[model samples]
Target: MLPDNHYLSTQTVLSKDPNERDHMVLHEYVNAAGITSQGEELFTGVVPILVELDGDVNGHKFSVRGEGEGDATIGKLTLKFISTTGKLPVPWPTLVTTLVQAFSRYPDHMKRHDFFKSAMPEGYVQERTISFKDDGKYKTRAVVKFEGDTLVNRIELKGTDFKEDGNILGHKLEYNFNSHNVYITADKQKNGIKANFTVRHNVEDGSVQLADHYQQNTPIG
Candidate 1:
């Protein structure tokens, strides 16, 4: 849906029509995938086999995560194709904002890390959950709070609130205030889905922020 022009392009997930394009391609290799199951029932019929496909997609890589069944089955494979370097024969959405770029690289768990140090260990508080959807589904919240006498700001992602959808995208923290949108790659497991992981304001006074790259959350000072 969030596709761009040629040479296998990429576009804004924030575009007026992020769901504007449905793409397909004929070349690629499996980066990683789950083993085919013995044989499963997908309904009133035999599923033949089922497998999982990881989507760190690239030029020589692509396929639906499911294996086929039934001769006249006419399987409906509804998957959004992906590109690693932004070129494509068929275009699908790319993880534009909170999905790309990179973070400190931590395992996907609810466990916490004070990436910025002293990130409100005991006094950490959450600001409720906010829902998000680009193609896949997930939520975001300001684990970020102004805590302690130091007047420091800290951000955290409660595993229950934020999801690392390996089936679709990675999880990253975008602050309404700060300068970076932190990215974390969800593991390549059959099940898609990170830790409590705390990070603090580089300027110390973590008033308030949004994952918004535009940094528009404003002076909630």
Candidate 2:
């Protein structure tokens, strides 16, 4: 088995000058399963891709946005992804191909949002609305741990969320989900930010929309 820090240690890289301001640095262009960044393929299968980093952006702010993107936020730094290439697009998986491409292009604009943004939302608050219309059978939940505007960790995330070991970014995290609705929990502390984003679907085909869904589930933005 890989070391406890396998998810973050060797598998990923840092986005900033991480000498004293950072903890880890991943410098590899991961080739997607059966597909390369130079090419394209619809990844409908389970592929494992994890990116972990700890560093300082000096005084910059960044964020990622996409219809079905998946990512993990660690305080001020976020490892966003290039999602919405459709086919159950998760930012975690997008890291496989997008990071490879972003390596050549600007760090920002992974086709939609910043692949690596410096600042996260300041303060501790639930970024998502409490109520969702219960649109479809699936939901997305993000639980963030904060040391005051600085993200300590984010858990239960992405298409990469499902893993046999529940290990992420060098942290051993556990989550529970079953069909219909998804509930994830980690470090439910005083300094935390919870954003409940839900995307509804009926097995396949068909879409869902809710009043408090933050308009995430629309006619394909």
Candidate 3:
């Protein structure tokens, strides 16, 4: 049910069809050099993000903020919102190329990163799990792999050493998406990354989209 003008925003998931019109924003910067193998050859800095989409949604989640230069050296930058419901009869680019070869963000006691939403409840990959407070609180599980909009990999915050009980410090990710702009890369050591996120819409029609900005009728609780 995603094809009439089609609006899909990101930077932590934002869906559309409440009347097509979306947005995206991101500012990235990363430059790493040596450690674990005494290497050096990583430099990245791309910034110019502006996201604005005031309201409406039944589901959307993506927001993993900055920090990448050093300090155990791990970087993760995500822009979310996947699952427009299994792309029809399921041929969507060959079911998203084998769910990107079964994406993995590593914390697998099982699996279930939304399962593609359908009232969500199966083994749903052993009922999914993850909880981060940084230094202790409990809830450390992150595994992502989707097939209808590609994302055949991810493991956002690997656990099991419990970081002295902190549960896997940080810096571990997965990504794959090659459309609407461009994206295709592999992490956790395969090292073949790519990025190109375009489209910074500031209301290009809808006469002030969704009403003016962010679910407008202007006046609510």
Candidate 4:
């Protein structure tokens, strides 16, 4: 059973400088779970990942990477796995691996947007739009929520042609799916921001296979 509020909230690094508009590195745990069906199960590693945010850009830009362990039990069995480069992908389980490369640009970009740019948007609002990049990448009709002149939240960042195996049609898969994060504790001093982010997922029934997760912080240019 879950507690009264039913979720864990951690201290996140929202911004390097609160007064300056910049990319905030969000650090938080991924530990919630739920059950879907009778025979099948679901669960997550509950580890933390570093989501490097590019607040000065047109959209949310960041990297999701981590490592760690824990378990999600099935009917009568236990499955466990370790998180690392050899064991998992660089951005384990997440598909957007390359987008994080743009993180370094945030520190410089925010300085211009908040301090240098004379004209800016009035208030925060939600809108649906699409953008075609020069790098041959295209995002169509994405759902985004803006927080005034401070931040932009992506509701469901899905792939253009995202597909999943239809094998477990009725069975519940033991893992995280359709996960979204909320930014926490933005640096009010630099980028005018503060926020916390947590990812949600389903749990298992009676199985013992636990889930695990972790995070890695890299230097900025």
Task: State the C-alpha lDDT per candidate.
Answer: 0.23, 0.22, 0.20, 0.22
Error of 3 at 14 (Å): 14
Candidate 4 global Cα RMSD: 21.0
Better of 1 and 2 by TM-score: 2
- Root-mean-square deviation of candidate 1: 21.3
Displacement of the residue 72 alpha carbon in candidate 1, Å: 66
User: Could you tell me which 10 consecutive residues in candidate 1 have the lowest summed lDDT?
Assistant: 1-10
lDDT of 3 by residue, 1-221 (tens): 11011121222222233432122122222222111100111112221121111111112222222111111122223332233332122111111111111111212221221112211111012111222233221112222222332222322222221234211222121121222322222222321222222322222222110101111000011
- Candidate 2 achieves a global lDDT of 0.22
- Candidate 3: C-alpha lDDT: 0.20
TM-score of 4: 0.20
- Write out the backbone clash pairs for model 2: 12-26, 13-26, 61-119, 62-117, 70-91, 75-151
Give per-residue lDDT, candidate 1, residue 177.
20
Shift of residue 180 alpha carbon in model 1, Å:
15
- Candidate 2, superposed: residue stretches over 4 Å from native: 1-116, 120-126, 134-151, 154-198, 201-211, 215-221
What is the descending TM-score order?
A: 4, 2, 3, 1
lDDT by residue (tens digit), candidate 4, 102-190:
11111221222221011111211121222211111223221112133221222223223211221122122233333343222223344
lDDT per residue as tens, model 1, 1-221: 11111110111222222552323321111111111211111112322322232222222333322222221122111122333333322122222221110011222232132121122222222232322333222222232222321222222222222234421223222211222222222223411112221122122243321222211111121
Q: CA shift at 124, candidate 3, in angstroms?
A: 17
Per-candidate TM-score against the hidden true structure = 0.16, 0.19, 0.18, 0.20
Q: Is candidate 2 or 3 superior in lDDT? A: 2
